[PDB]
Design a protein around this nucleic acid. Structure first.
Lengths: 97, 93, 105, 79, 11, 16, 90, 103, 78, 97, 16, 11
DNA sequence: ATCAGAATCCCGGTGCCGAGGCCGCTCAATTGGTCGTAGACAGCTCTAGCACCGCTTAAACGCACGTACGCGCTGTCCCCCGCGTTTTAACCGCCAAGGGGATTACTCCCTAGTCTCCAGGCACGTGTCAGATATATACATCGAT
DNA sequence: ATCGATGTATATATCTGACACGTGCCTGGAGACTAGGGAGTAATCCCCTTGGCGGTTAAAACGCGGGGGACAGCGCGTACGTGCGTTTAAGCGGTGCTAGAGCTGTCTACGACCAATTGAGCGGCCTCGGCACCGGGATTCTGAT
């Protein structure tokens, strides 16, 4: 049969998900997560749909930027696979803890 | 029950720069928010400048200095030129 | 033409900027020239970003500015990118780039 | 219980957009923790803003203001 | 640069 | 491009 | 400047402990900076809700927005205690 | 006085005057300066107590900027609050990466 | 004139930073970074002193310029 | 008679992390600041406190940058900081494109 | 627990 | 923690 | 390696729904006039920044050695990618309803503004002790034996 | 393991200038008072958020095989750290000068404020073409040979 070499599918995946602009996380699970997280700060809260959409936009943009930085970190160590240590280094350098 | 925006003015500017290009509603909202953000930045810097020098009025000089502080480099130079020309033209009339 | 914008030869509402400055209590008083300068600066910045957005839209064979085009225009200019360094554009995506070492031999 | 809603393929897609070619197996839990921390930080400020106005529904402007508090603006959710 | 030549050329 | 705009702005004001 | 008040607080918490002039300037700058941050946040909050009066509620919410958890909780407790004490007496 | 009426040491009147002159809003409430002064007093007391402990640990009876820097950086919460701030002649926290240490 | 930031000075700064070994090419990079940072801060401070129509760069101007870039500085008569 | 390499470096690290005075000679730094400011409005003048504040800020910035650089170098399983480490730290911090 | 201090302040400031 | 024991102890 | 198989783009035909244009009106920007105050401007004064000289030294600089470290090369083996099946839950559409945001009308109480006055705070002057410095001393470290 | 050679904390003595305090003055905060509008409350209307239900189907979970890259190990060159001898200019003390920061007094140009006015922009409505979508064929593009 036919089978691509390990890695080439990932390249086209990068190209596709960099060309497009839609959200990557499923809306309903993210909304449920946001609702639960906010539930402890104050009970019986309600959310405008636009509020949840804005939360998802901000979270996805932040995660994408963090992944760019941690990819730079991993490459700097003569590696290709990103590991948790790269994420921790990127966050530590960014100042956030 | 009356919202205000820069949608009309942004549309005129676009039609003047690109005579045949349209703009989506989401892009229009984004441009509106961008204009508001830049206005807030410049006005806040001008207010801080006025309060720093014990003044009490925001003049053209303060706004120009705030622009020079905020905008990076060539953008700042061109914006300063544009504002100076606009003020000279306005005072001439 | 009653409008101060017509006097200044601008396309932005000089009167509205003056009212916003007076209402936002940035200072006790507001000079007459300040709204003109601020409106001119805002108009120039809007024109500058919109020109690049239109160029990007034309490159994409479209004729309607969409947030993707605005994001491309902003990120493809060092000056604007520096200005909007901390800004996140909704539905803007990211600039297409790939680190060289990831590419195959 | 609900943090698992951010499934592994979703994190993989986010990393792919970020420009990552290979992913270690332990990345997913760290990413979930990071996202949870970020969401707590933003949502706490949003809920505080809402509570100040004596409202019971978080609106988009509250999220925008919380993001501005965290030194991270966001365009396209009302001026 | 080219922006200054382009900014002046508006009409 | 400027004098014409200034004259038009200063023309119709009192005539209204 | 806040030199006198910082001095009284220091003698209240640490009876026998001086403070250098440079450290006093440090503390004065810190007090000014925190006051400016809190006042700016309260002004932003008031302008948000179309309000036109900074009250104790606005400053309390600004404190809850600026300081970290335990610090914010203790600061809010102290502020509420002081406000109730000042209101009860006159 | 107002400051003494609230059981505070910080100047309530001066804070009220600063709030008024700083054009933060059109009007300023009555309890707002009291609340602000109480918060400022609490923060000052916290940082001063930590700095005094640090100075005592250094066998000195006089607060210096080094003590303030030590107190700020050694407390995680104050460090988070005082994140993007530099203290003149404050020095740095004494640390060394464990790998750099010899065998 | 930038070469006035001597090699041992950069070495001392790195030592305070907790750096054990130092590559030879580090010094030029550090000089460039310091020049860029000083250029930005000094440009902002000079603009501030321009607006006041003064001819002397006061310390408060430097403090304002630092605060512009999110670097608050304490202990300069603020 | 002859300390093995790395010992005097550790002693210097312990010493300079304990003290608080500035590490760059005042006069060369002042000359550098004046020469940089010469590009902008000429015939400028500086208060001594202004130059002092500039020096303090520069020292703090450089120390923080070197700390992040050391973290980067350690991440690559090294002990010697290299220019690529400074570039990576600055790029992640956001000071560079 | 400084009600006495508050009363004195209400008196001392009023004594002036 | 120790801050709560310290915050209450003011006088 | 050239060729087979799998994305990928690019052509053309349709449907539609969101962008673009028109209209009434209404409320917000203009035009006219004033009035008092912020700010421009001339003048003096005195602080402080700049310029220069001598001279010590402490730091910088240049050089030699060698050793620890960066870096290239290999083996390996295990972890991660690609892919095919099966399961699952997002989601899209539709329906109900009730909490709660948004407006509007009234009351009043809380805060701005004024006058008076006096005490807290600030500049100034002064004494002395915490701290800086020097020196001999004892102790912790460390590197070759 | 160890001990001589270095570096460092320790204890004691001395000197000093920055801090802690006392004093006189003054101006800003407090007390008393009035006026008015910001907002707190209630009452109402209707958008819009939540909740449920059901069929689709695309996506997630899962298992499996294998290639590649992470990592440990080894060797080799070389480039920094250490120490020493020579140079130099930072720093300190001192002097002298003058520019401009800062304060004071004067005047007036201008922005807040108010009133009558009208048209610029906004909400609502209607229409069509830009674009999304569907579908097939040419086009690259990749991997085994």
């Amino acid at each position: 049969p036919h089978r691509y070499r390990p890695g080439t599918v990932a390249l086209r995946e990068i190209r596709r998900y960099q060309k497009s602009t839609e959200l990557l996380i499923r809306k309903l699970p993210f909304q449920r997560l946001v609702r639960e997280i906010a539930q402890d700060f104050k009970t019986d809260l309600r959310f405008q749909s636009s509020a949840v959409m804005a939360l998802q936009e901000a979270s996805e943009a932040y995660l994408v930027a963090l992944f760019e930085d941690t990819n730079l970190c991993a490459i700097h160590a003569k590696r290709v696979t990103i590991m948790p240590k790269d994420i921790q280094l990127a966050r530590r350098i960014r100042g956030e803890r | 029950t009356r919202k205000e925006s820069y949608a009309i003015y942004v549309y005129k500017v676009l039609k003047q720069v690109h005579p045949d290009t349209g703009i989506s509603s989401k892009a229009m909202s984004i441009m509106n928010s961008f204009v508001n953000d830049v206005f807030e930045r410049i006005a806040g810097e001008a207010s801080r400048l006025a309060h720093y020098n014990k003044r009490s009025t925001i003049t053209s000089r303060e706004i120009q200095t705030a622009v020079r502080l905020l905008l990076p480099g060539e953008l700042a130079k061109h914006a300063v030129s544009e504002g100076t020309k606009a003020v000279t033209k306005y005072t001439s009339a | 033409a009653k409008t101060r914008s017509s006097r200044a030869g601008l396309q932005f509402p000089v009167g509205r900027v003056h009212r916003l400055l007076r209402k936002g209590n940035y200072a006790e008083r507001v000079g007459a020239g300040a709204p003109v300068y601020l409106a001119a600066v805002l108009e120039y910045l809007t024109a500058e970003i919109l020109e690049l957005a239109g160029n990007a839209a034309r490159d994409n064979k479209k004729t309607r500015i969409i947030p993707r085009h605005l994001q491309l225009a902003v990120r493809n200019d060092e000056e604007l990118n520096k200005l909007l360094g901390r800004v996140t554009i909704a539905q803007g995506g990211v600039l297409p780039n790939i680190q060289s070492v990831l590419l195959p031999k | 219980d609900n943090i698992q809603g951010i499934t592994k393929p979703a994190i993989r897609r986010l990393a792919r957009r970020g420009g990552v070619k290979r992913i270690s197996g332990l990345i997913y839990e760290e990413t979930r923790g990071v996202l949870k921390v970020f969401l707590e930080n933003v949502i706490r400020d949003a809920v505080t803003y809402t509570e100040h106005a004596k409202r019971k529904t978080v609106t988009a402007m509250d999220v925008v203001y919380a993001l501005k508090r965290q030194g991270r603006t966001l365009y396209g959710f009302g001026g | 640069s080219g922006r200054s030549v382009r900014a002046e050329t508006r009409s | 491009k400027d004098d014409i705009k200034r004259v038009m702005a200063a023309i119709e004001k009192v005539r209204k």
